[PDB]
Amino acid sequence: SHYVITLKAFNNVGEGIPLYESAVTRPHTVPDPTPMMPPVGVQASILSHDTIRITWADNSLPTDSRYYTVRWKTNIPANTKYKNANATTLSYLVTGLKPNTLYEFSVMVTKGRRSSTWSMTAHGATFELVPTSPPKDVTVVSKEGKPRTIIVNWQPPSEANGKITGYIIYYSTDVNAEIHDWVIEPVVGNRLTHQIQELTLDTPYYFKIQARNSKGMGPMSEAVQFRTP
Amino acid sequence: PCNYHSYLFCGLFGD
Amino acid sequence: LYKLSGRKSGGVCLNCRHNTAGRHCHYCKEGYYRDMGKPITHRKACKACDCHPVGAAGKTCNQTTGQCPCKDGVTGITCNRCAKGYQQSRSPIAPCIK
Amino acid sequence: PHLRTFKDNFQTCKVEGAWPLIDNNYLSVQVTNVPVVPGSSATATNKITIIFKAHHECTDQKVYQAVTDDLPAAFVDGTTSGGDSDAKSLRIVERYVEMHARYIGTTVFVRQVGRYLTLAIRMPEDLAMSYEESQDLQLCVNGCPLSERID
Ligand SMILES: *[C@@H]1O[C@H](CO)[C@@H](O)[C@H](O)[C@H]1NC(C)=O
Numbered sequence A: 001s002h003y004v005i006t007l008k009a010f011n012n013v014g015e016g017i018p019l020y021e022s023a024v025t026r027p028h029t030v031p032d033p034t035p036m037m038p039p040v041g042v043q044a045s046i047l048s049h050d051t052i053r054i055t056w057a058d059n060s061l062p063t064d065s066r067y068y069t070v071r072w073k074t075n076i077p078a079n080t081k082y083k084n085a086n087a088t089t090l091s092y093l094v095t096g097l098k099p100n101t102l103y104e105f106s107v108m109v110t111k112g113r114r115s116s117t118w119s120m121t122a123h124g125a126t127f128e129l130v131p132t133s134p135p136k137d138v139t140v141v142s143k144e145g146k147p148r149t150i151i152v153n154w155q156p157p158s159e160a161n162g163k164i165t166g167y168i169i170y171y172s173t174d175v176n177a178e179i180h181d182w183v184i185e186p187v188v189g190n191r192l193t194h195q196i197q198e199l200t201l202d203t204p205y206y207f208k209i210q211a212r213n214s215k216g217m218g219p220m221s222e223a224v225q226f227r228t229p
Numbered sequence B: 001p002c003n004y005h006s007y008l009f010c011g012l013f014g015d
Numbered sequence C: 001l002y003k004l005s006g007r008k009s010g011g012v013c014l015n016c017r018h019n020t021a022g023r024h025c026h027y028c029k030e031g032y033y034r035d036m037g038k039p040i041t042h043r044k045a046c047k048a049c050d051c052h053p054v055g056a057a058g059k060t061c062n063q064t065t066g067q068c069p070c071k072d073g074v075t076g077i078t079c080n081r082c083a084k085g086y087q088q089s090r091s092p093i094a095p096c097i098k
Numbered sequence D: 001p002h003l004r005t006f007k008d009n010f011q012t013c014k015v016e017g018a019w020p021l022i023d024n025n026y027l028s029v030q031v032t033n034v035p036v037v038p039g040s041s042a043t044a045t046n047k048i049t050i051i052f053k054a055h056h057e058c059t060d061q062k063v064y065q066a067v068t069d070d071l072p073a074a075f076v077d078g079t080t081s082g083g084d085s086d087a088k089s090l091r092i093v094e095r096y097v098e099m100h101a102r103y104i105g106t107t108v109f110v111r112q113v114g115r116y117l118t119l120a121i122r123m124p125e126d127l128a129m130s131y132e133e134s135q136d137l138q139l140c141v142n143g144c145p146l147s148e149r150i151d
Helices: none
Strands: A002-007 A019-024 A040-046 A052-057 A067-073 A083-087 A091-094 A102-110 A122-125 A139-142 A150-153 A166-172 A183-188 A193-196 A204-211 A224-227 B007-013 C032-034 C046-048 D002-004 D010-012 D019-023 D027-034 D044-052 D062-066 D090-094 D097-101 D106-113 D116-124
Touching: A040 A102, A040 A122, A052 A102, A052 A122, A067 A091, A083 A091, A091 A102, A139 A224, A150 A204, A166 A193, A183 A193, B007 D019, D019 D116, D027 D116, D044 D116
Parallel strands: none
Antiparallel strands: A002 A019, A040 A052, A052 A091, A067 A083, A067 A102, A102 A122, A139 A150, A150 A193, A166 A183, A166 A204, A204 A224, B007 D002, B007 D116, C032 C046, D002 D010, D019 D027, D027 D044, D044 D062, D090 D097, D097 D106, D106 D116
16 A cells, blocks of 8 residues: 655644655565475376377375466467466367477366466377478579579478478470479489479470478479570 | 597578 | 674665565576676566466476476476477376376 | 688679579588568579488488578487487577587588578588589589679
8 A cells, every 4th residue: 555654743732744755565475385295196198190199197185176277389480379278177189280290298177266286298290291282482494604504492391291212393385284294303302302304495494393201291382484596 | 438538600580 | 794704794674675685685586597698787687487387296487597496307498388299297296108 | 692702712603493503422511591571683582402411320211391480409300419419419409599519520600680591611622522423513612603693
């Protein structure tokens, strides 16, 4: 509370001119409730590319209305927050996850005003999957020095769904023709550039790049226009 | 074991 | 203290605030570790040492690096994650089992 | 984007779209560019891709990707350390985000300035002068093409 204190000098004839001052009293300290014991034996069991089941135990358990809380987060994208989910049983099934990405898991117990901190961090990495997005930023430019050679530049797709082992480049004069007509030019996954030699003159070239994975192959991308003089 | 046993710099900044 | 200083100085500060110690009145405390980025005279000179209650053995940690005394060879900075090949256990004595 | 090569050469190259700065058998660097003003000479980097090659005994192949309004402290695989968890050869430190690679003596410094990212790489001479067959396009080592250059 904010008190206003007034001081007056008084004698037998009466009270004098007052002197005022105000002060705000310091808040009473409140003791924090003693915390609970956190859950033990936290194990991550990977089931699929988007599902991981979390199992934890409780030494306090020999009725109560105590509920457990689960949290998980991936480092990509940046500065993201932990996804929370409530569980009344000793296990929880995590859904809606990305394939081939490391996740951190921990559990806490909440009884009321009294609640325990997060349990020991258990890491669970999702299973790999067939890529669901084609490689973005397809850029083709004429090389200064040796015009018969033209360099193709690509970036990895957003939905890689696993460790990329290779890349397949497709180039042909006609777009309407199927994949069997287009020449196959596969490369290594660790390299995102490839020099193409012996290219025909006065022919419009079209490009399509695909990504390689242990589970399958990446989808097709839109062709780009590039003509040779 | 895994370690290396003159440093050259490379910069890139927008306008 | 005036006798031990060789008749130089003998003034010792009373009830040191802002979690400091010594007659000089600058120092750090247990359950806490020193931040190397800022000097000892600074307010935020000692960071909180958040040692895990089931992971770490003790509360008092390493003052220069900020490492909690881990049990069963835990790799965690605050003794929060089990080591390679080790799985989380129900026992309070052995938190990680190979 | 203002270029500063290992040979201490300053060149103002447009480098529109995906262009490789560093390309060898030890480290891969890929950057894409978009103009701040539509249909103008001025350009700026929007996405940086760092690929570490699969080396036996030290670290597995980990792909790093950084875009606009996104400064990750880890790779697309979600992991913070290269290869095995016990291996401390490849590490990423955040504050400004920095990369440390003791197996190839490199230090990459990345940070968001305004609406576009910044880049700074420190690498030794021997590792910077490594090149395989059909690998001669390096903007970090050699000068950028005259076609992209403005004079
Ligand atoms: C868990 O339950 C508490 C209490 O009902 C609530 O405050 C909290 O938001 C719940 N969280 C989720 C994710 O269900």
